Amino acid sequence: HWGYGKHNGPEHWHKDFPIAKGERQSPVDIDTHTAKYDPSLKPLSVSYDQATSLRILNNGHAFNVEFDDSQDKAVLKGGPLDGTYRLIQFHFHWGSLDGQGSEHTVDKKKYAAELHLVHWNTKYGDFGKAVQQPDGLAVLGIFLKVGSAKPGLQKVVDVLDSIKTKGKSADFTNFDPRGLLPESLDYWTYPGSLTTPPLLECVTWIVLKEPISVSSEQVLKFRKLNFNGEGEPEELMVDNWRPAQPLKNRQIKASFK
Ligand SMILES: NS(=O)(=O)c1ccc(NC(=O)NS(=O)(=O)c2ccc(F)cc2)cn1
Numbered sequence: 001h002w003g004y005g006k007h008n009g010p011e012h013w014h015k016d017f018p019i020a021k022g023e024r025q026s027p028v029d030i031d032t033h034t035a036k037y038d039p040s041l042k043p044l045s046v047s048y049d050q051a052t053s054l055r056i057l058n059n060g061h062a063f064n065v066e067f068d069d070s071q072d073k074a075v076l077k078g079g080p081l082d083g084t085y086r087l088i089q090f091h092f093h094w095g096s097l098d099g100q101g102s103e104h105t106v107d108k109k110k111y112a113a114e115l116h117l118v119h120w121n122t123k124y125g126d127f128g129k130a131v132q133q134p135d136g137l138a139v140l141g142i143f144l145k146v147g148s149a150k151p152g153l154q155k156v157v158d159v160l161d162s163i164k165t166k167g168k169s170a171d172f173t174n175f176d177p178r179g180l181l182p183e184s185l186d187y188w189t190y191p192g193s194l195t196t197p198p199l200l201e202c203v204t205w206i207v208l209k210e211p212i213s214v215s216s217e218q219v220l221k222f223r224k225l226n227f228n229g230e231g232e233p234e235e236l237m238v239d240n241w242r243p244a245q246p247l248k249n250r251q252i253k254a255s256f257k
């Protein structure tokens with residue numbers, strides 16, 4: 001039932017998913033002047049050299065590039081995290097216009113899109129288990145702005161015509177997620193949630209300060225995807241972002257001065 005339309009959008013989600021009004025919901029606005037530098041935060045460790053991408057799927061709300069997470073092949077460690085978190089998938093949220101699309105905002109600024117690299121804590125054995133734990137997931141969030149093309153994104157962009165509609169998938173092997181990362185790993189971090197239903201409060205959010213640049217042509221191809229299934233009326237997959245939620249009793253920490 002849920003989606004991003006007028007009658008099933010983020011303002012409606014709480015009826016099926018009451019945790020939508022919970023104490024640690026995501027995304028949030030990152031007020032850069034109120035975030036506090038935490039000198040004890042360790043450097044982030046992104047170890048994606050052995051990543052095994054498998055498939056790309058249009059799930060009716062975004063597209064997921066899925067990875068083999070049956071071994072420690074692509075892992076996130078360090079930063080605020082205790083232990084090892086395995087990459088399971090990445091996806092994006094984006095707008096109908098370049099002035100919106102990101103879920104997190106920075107001093108109320110919206111970016112054109114936001115990349116989420118989703119990882120689960122290996123002490124919980126699998127993803128299903130992990131989402132039931134307050135420290136189950138670590139999502140690495142990366143802002144996208146429109147400017148120069150991101151060469152490492154192009155392989156993703158070019159397969160999207162083959163997964164135009166909900167439920168379509170395509171082989172997507174040998175994709176290197178390192179090509180989607182910015183130069184700096186400076187980040188903000190806070191405890192939060194999944195930003196789509198079931199909105200579970202299981203995520204340590206790590207949001208990078210440096211956005212990546214993608215071209216207008218690249219983002220325009222995102223906007224050609226469909227929310228609908230094949231043979232249903234076309235509704236463009238755009239504005240698949242949840243707006244900022246109340247920070248409540250949380251402090252955002254910065255890894256950098
Ligand atoms: N936007 S986000 O916070 O990175 C994010 C990542 C993942 C999800 N949801 C998700 O994976 N849902 S799911 O695949 O159907 C699923 C699978 C297993 C579960 F136990 C619970 C949910 C929602 N949001």
Ligand SMILES: [Zn+2]
Binds near residue numbers: 092093
């Ligand atoms: Zn997401």
